[PDB]
Design a protein around this ligand. Structure first.
Ligand SMILES: *[C@@H]1O[C@H](CO)[C@@H](O)[C@H](O)[C@H]1NC(C)=O
Ligand SMILES: *[C@@H]1O[C@H](CO)[C@@H](O)[C@H](O)[C@H]1NC(C)=O
Ligand SMILES: *[C@@H]1O[C@H](CO)[C@@H](O)[C@H](O)[C@H]1NC(C)=O
Ligand SMILES: *[C@@H]1O[C@H](CO)[C@@H](O)[C@H](O)[C@H]1NC(C)=O
Ligand SMILES: *[C@@H]1O[C@H](CO)[C@@H](O)[C@H](O)[C@H]1NC(C)=O
Ligand SMILES: *[C@@H]1O[C@H](CO)[C@@H](O)[C@H](O)[C@H]1NC(C)=O
Ligand SMILES: *[C@@H]1O[C@H](CO)[C@@H](O)[C@H](O)[C@H]1NC(C)=O
Ligand SMILES: *[C@@H]1O[C@H](CO)[C@@H](O)[C@H](O)[C@H]1NC(C)=O
Lengths: 366, 346, 224, 50, 198
């Protein structure tokens, strides 16, 4: 610690002792259903962009490794989560949105974009924590005469709010002459056909887009991935993995009066101290196990190599990862004498230490 | 505002004004000498038992070493300040069992044998008046482990890696030093501060102390009961002043309050995101892959390191101010108690 | 019918988050109830749609089956898909389809093509109960606390926390709110919410005892 | 700028302590002036004779 | 006319507060101390003000330094003429050269140049593409402008922190000098000191 081979007389703070965990426990809810990803990804005909379908996915085991087999896309583009780590963590609810766009307006489905799809048909919020997938569909979504089945809205009075739908098909009025069901000057139909054709360029093929919206974990945890649970342990410094919230601590029985909506417990430093077990409705306190400062009390290396160790601020009936109890921790390797000399190496509350003769050994005295 | 009352003193070239009596007044001067000693673990504060956070924190170099060195220097300097202020005698003098000092009674400043601590009455009011923060100068891991009531602030400070060291000299040793100094200046006069303590009667020492200011010594000997009664009333009014008003010790109260508030702000700095996606490191570990979580961890590490450096700089400036006040208190201790000073308003 | 605009007199606050904090003061930015607001004491014995704008709540002191029905929505009857939450003793019929109503809405004692039909727990039972119908991020979180009113009068002084119980998300556009009392005198209150910063006083049990508004008077700004 | 303020609020309390330090210096300047100059109890007026 | 430096300092959020004691109150306190020193001597700083003619006060000041008080009453006119000549010499030296007040000029100039540097630091890019915040707001989308605004926020926060630390150190030095000046006010004006070169 001192980056030197010889040390001088005094007390040095070197490092810290900490009890390493010996067990790892994982607590997941007892659910058995399989999430319906096949009925979302493998469909005969998706709806258009102005009328995207919303499907709620909950109360099932979500396996995200079978997504690649259902549809031949390239990459699993996500923003708030990495595409790598879906399975170990778990969420509250999963929403599915699907629509078919052109190849130019793919980057508009992203948080904070401006265009035609983003302004009047489908807008993503400021803080999106889901995934967006897109792949080419030139073989199942094109005719030589033209695919007139899908529409997009070209004009609207105002931009949409995030996660909004506009199904109404009234004639848009841009002038002062009233429309009254007549499409003329400044009375334009909002929906325009895409007009897909197999002989287009690379930027103009139809693209099927599926949105995997995720919300972060809250009081319910209905949809969660595949992970084997572990029996609960208490009063031991262990690793806990409660619904994807990893950490290390000691679980004890609690007397906190949680309300039925409350699930977690946060302190002034914004870290979890109280958790609710999803299997058995009980509250467990989370505290770290035994740790503290370690100080080395030594004379010089020119004199001796005998070292006393001061474990700072612990009631040392719990030493491991002569013994005198001090008000400033406790000493190991220094005996206490019933005398009083001048203070050579200071330790704490009136207690010092020195290296003396009367077999040489390290003593501690007031 | 009003600068003061208006006085037009009557001046003439053949007029003199001379006092015909005197009053004896006892005042009170309060000076801070030291503050709380704090030791900060940077690795537990920044990372919190995360391995790759430690691996990415080793890339930043030796910031932790120099911040720990600065805080260790402050902790050494506080004990040095207390040692140079209070410890000024080679021998612990003791008062005689008789309590007659020419009519002056020092029963409200000399220690009493009933209490386990050797603290006098006025020192008992001074220690009861200042509300300490009750920090980790006593060991508190047994109380922090045992879940009683709610979560304390000091338990959160201990769990986040912030530790308060106890001072080297206990309150009993400070009270013993104060009692030895009081007994020396009561019995031996100013002669104990310049070598061997030479005994003297207290009325004759009082005659010398009137002789040093320009008043002849026959004034005291003809009026000794009046000086005794005035001194008794003056030292009795300090009791009634300190038993009611709690605004006298505001300097020591602010010394406690600043070191509590700095630690509270340093703990509260952990809840900010610093431009990342989450303020909790384990959510960043579990939610992201290697490179992106390395970017977020680097952002959090820079923010927490900036907070810790700000705390260390503020503690260094406050330590310089406290050291200046402790040097002033040591000079006032040497020149007012151990002798007699002719400096005006000192 | 007759409407009257009274004052709430510093009443109404809910739990912001779904976590537990003990013995701490915490500041939250949320669509909150303005202290010393201008609420409406509506009176009806026979009901238009209030201009719902980023927050609304409810408060009534009536009993029995007359106090029910909380139909939301932009337009009723037909055309645009709007939310038509109906309520009774044991059922909440969530529907995006529109019931065949008219210009005069009534519930007979003696719909359309629906996209999301949800059935959940009922939202109801001198007791002036309070209910919150806050809309943010298309979630419609509902907070409620039973408040037994001592003397039947206007909204009293108190800072009782309304507990979160109901989270039913309907991500549509809602700007109006009608009401669906049973048709076979009602002292129900209508108030508003606004985005403002608060500072809540917790305890060791987890109940909001006091709450200060950081924009009421400069003394509370100093306190914040 | 609203966006700059909304992203500055994510940096924690790096400004309350700045305002506290500047307020402490501003109080200390007036304390210094009051300590140096206000060392008399009554305002003394010189006689008109010189 | 033209945009002043103080106008830009105010427009950028840097404000200078006025002191509590105005210069008239400082002059009144100085006049009160002068009248007390002229009439009473040292007894106005140790209780009630006791009058004394200035010749006898000057004789007591001579008796303080160890010279017997009969050399004043035999040499009063010479001492009065020497004091008047010294006062005139100080007046001429203050009217001639202004370089004695260089420390007060430095106290003014340091807080002038620190605020000027704090204003001038706003023209830096700190690694971004533009120093103007509205240009980044109106030129990019949300994510990239958030990145550049974060860079500018980090740079401006660093500059403000450096200014606050320098102000704290200067305030400590000013407090030490003010304590020395208060000791010199209590010991030289309200009394007579035996300390050498104090
Ligand atoms: C999609 O579903 C149909 C009917 O269930 C099935 O015949 C077809 O094989 C499925 N496609 C894929 C790629 O699994
Ligand atoms: C899950 O476990 C809890 C307690 O062991 C039990 O009450 C609950 O019924 C279980 N879930 C199911 C679906 O059986
Ligand atoms: C904690 O330390 C105190 C002080 O010596 C002691 O009385 C007590 O028994 C200790 N608690 C234990 C060993 O559990
Ligand atoms: C002394 O004072 C009186 C008035 O106070 C004045 O008339 C007289 O001239 C003074 N003495 C001298 C020598 O000037
Ligand atoms: C001094 O004070 C104590 C306590 O007030 C009293 O008991 C004692 O008699 C006093 N002594 C004299 C001489 O007045
Ligand atoms: C509410 O608005 C009415 C409108 O005239 C007004 O008379 C009344 O004073 C307001 N109440 C308040 C502001 O408390
Ligand atoms: C959606 O709500 C907004 C409220 O700001 C309103 O202005 C807009 O007209 C609504 N859209 C429709 C189609 O009613
Ligand atoms: C917290 O709950 C306990 C339960 O008995 C009660 O005694 C105590 O008064 C409560 N504290 C409050 C409401 O502040």
């Amino acid at each position: 610690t001192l980056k030197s081979f010889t040390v001088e007389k005094g007390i040095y703070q070197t490092s810290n002792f900490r009890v390493q965990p010996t067990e790892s426990i994982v607590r997941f809810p007892n659910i058995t259903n399989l999430c319906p990803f096949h009925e979302v990804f493998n469909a005969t005909t998706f709806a258009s962009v102005y009328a995207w379908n919303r499907k709620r996915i909950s109360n099932c085991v979500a396996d995200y490794s079978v997504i690649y087999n259902f549809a031949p896309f390239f990459a699993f583009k996500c923003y708030g989560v990495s595409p790598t780590k879906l399975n170990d963590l778990c969420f509250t609810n999963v929403y599915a949105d699907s629509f078919v766009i052109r190849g130019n307006e793919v980057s508009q489905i992203a948080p904070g974009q401006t265009g035609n799809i983003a302004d009047y048909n489908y807008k993503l919020p400021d803080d999106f924590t889901g995934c967006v997938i897109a792949w080419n569909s030139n073989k199942l979504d094109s005719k030589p005469s033209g695919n007139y089945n899908y529409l997009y809205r070209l004009l609207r009075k105002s931009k949409l709010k995030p996660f909004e739908r506009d199904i109404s098909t009234e004639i848009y009025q841009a002038g002062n002459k009233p429309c009254n069901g007549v499409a003329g000057p400044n009375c334009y139909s909002p929906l325009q056909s895409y007009g897909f054709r197999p002989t287009y360029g690379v930027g103009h093929q139809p693209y099927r887009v599926v949105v995997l919206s995720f919300e972060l974990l809250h009081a319910p945890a209905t949809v969660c991935g595949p992970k084997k649970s572990t029996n609960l342990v208490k009063n031991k410094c262990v690793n806990f993995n409660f619904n994807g919230l990893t950490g290390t601590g000691v679980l004890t029985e609690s007397n906190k009066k949680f309300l039925p909506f409350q699930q977690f417990g946060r302190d002034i430093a914004d870290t979890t101290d109280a958790v609710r077990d999803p299997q058995t409705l009980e509250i467990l306190d989370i505290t770290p196990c035994s740790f503290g400062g370690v100080s080395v009390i030594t004379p010089g290396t020119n004199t001796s190599n005998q070292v006393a160790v001061l474990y700072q601020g612990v009631n040392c009936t719990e030493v491991p990862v002569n013994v005198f109890q001090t008000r400033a921790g406790c000493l190991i390797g220094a005996e206490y004498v019933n005398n009083s000399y001048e203070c050579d190496i200071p330790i704490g509350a009136g207690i010092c230490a020195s290296y003396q003769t009367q077999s040489q050994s390290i003593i501690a005295y007031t | 505002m009003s600068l003061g009352a208006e006085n037009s003193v009557a001046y003439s070239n053949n007029s003199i004004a001379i006092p015909t009596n005197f009053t004896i007044s006892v005042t009170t001067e309060i000076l801070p000498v030291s503050m709380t000693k704090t030791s900060v673990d940077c690795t537990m504060y920044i990372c919190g038992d995360s391995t790759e956070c430690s691996n990415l924190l080793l890339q930043y170099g030796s910031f932790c070493t120099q911040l720990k060195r600065a805080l260790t220097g402050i902790a050494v300097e506080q004990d040095k300040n207390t040692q140079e202020v209070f410890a000024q005698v080679k021998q612990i003098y003791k008062t005689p069992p008789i309590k007659y000092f020419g009519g002056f009674n020092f029963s409200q400043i000399l220690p009493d044998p009933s209490k386990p601590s050797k603290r006098s009455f006025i020192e008992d009011l001074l220690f009861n008046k200042v509300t300490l923060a009750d920090a980790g100068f006593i060991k508190q891991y047994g109380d922090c482990l045992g879940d009683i009531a709610a979560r304390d602030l000091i338990c959160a400070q201990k769990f986040n890696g912030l530790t308060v060291l106890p001072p080297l000299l206990t309150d009993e040793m400070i009270a013993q030093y104060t009692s030895a100094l009081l007994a020396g200046t009561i019995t031996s006069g100013w002669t104990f501060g310049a070598g061997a303590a030479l005994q003297i009667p207290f009325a004759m020492q009082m005659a010398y102390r009137f002789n040093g200011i320009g008043v002849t010594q026959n004034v005291l000997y003809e009026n000794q009961k009046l000086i005794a009664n005035q001194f008794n009333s003056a030292i009795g009014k300090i009791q009634d002043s300190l038993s009611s008003t709690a605004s006298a010790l505001g300097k020591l109260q602010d010394v406690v309050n600043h070191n509590a508030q700095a630690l509270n702000t340093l703990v509260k700095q952990l809840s900010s995101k610093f431009g990342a996606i989450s303020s909790v490191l384990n959510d960043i570990l579990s939610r992201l892959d290697k490179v992106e979580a390395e970017v977020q961890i680097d952002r959090l590490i820079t923010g927490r390191l900036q907070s810790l450096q700000t705390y260390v700089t503020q503690q260094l400036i406050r330590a310089a101010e406290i050291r200046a006040s402790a040097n002033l208190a040591a000079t006032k201790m040497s020149e007012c108690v151990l002798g007699q000073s002719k400096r005006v308003d000192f | 019918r007759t409407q009257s605009y009274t004052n709430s007199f510093t009443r109404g606050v809910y739990y912001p988050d779904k976590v537990f904090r003990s013995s701490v003061l915490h500041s939250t930015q949320d669509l909150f109830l303005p202290f010393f607001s201008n609420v409406t004491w509506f009176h009806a014995i026979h009901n238009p749609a209030l201009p719902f704008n980023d927050g609304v709540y409810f408060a009534s002191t009536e009993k029995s089956n007359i106090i029910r029905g909380w139909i939301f929505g932009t337009t009723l009857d037909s055309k645009t898909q709007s939310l038509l939450i109906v309520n009774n003793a044991t059922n909440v019929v969530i529907k995006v389809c529109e019931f065949q109503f008219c210009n005069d809405p009534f519930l007979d004692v003696y719909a359309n093509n629906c996209t999301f039909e949800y059935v959940s727990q009922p939202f109801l039972m001198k007791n002036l109960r309070e209910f919150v119908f806050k809309n943010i991020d298309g979630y419609f979180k509902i907070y409620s606390k039973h408040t037994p009113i001592n003397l039947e009068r206007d909204l009293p002084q108190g800072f009782s926390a309304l507990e979160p119980l109901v989270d039913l998300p309907i991500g549509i556009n809602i700007t109006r709110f009608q009401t669906l009392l049973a048709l076979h005198a009602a002292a129900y209150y209508v108030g508003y919410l606004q985005p403002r910063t608060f500072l809540l006083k917790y305890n060791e049990n987890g109940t909001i005892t006091d709450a200060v508004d950081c924009a009421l008077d400069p003394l509370s700004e100093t306190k914040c």
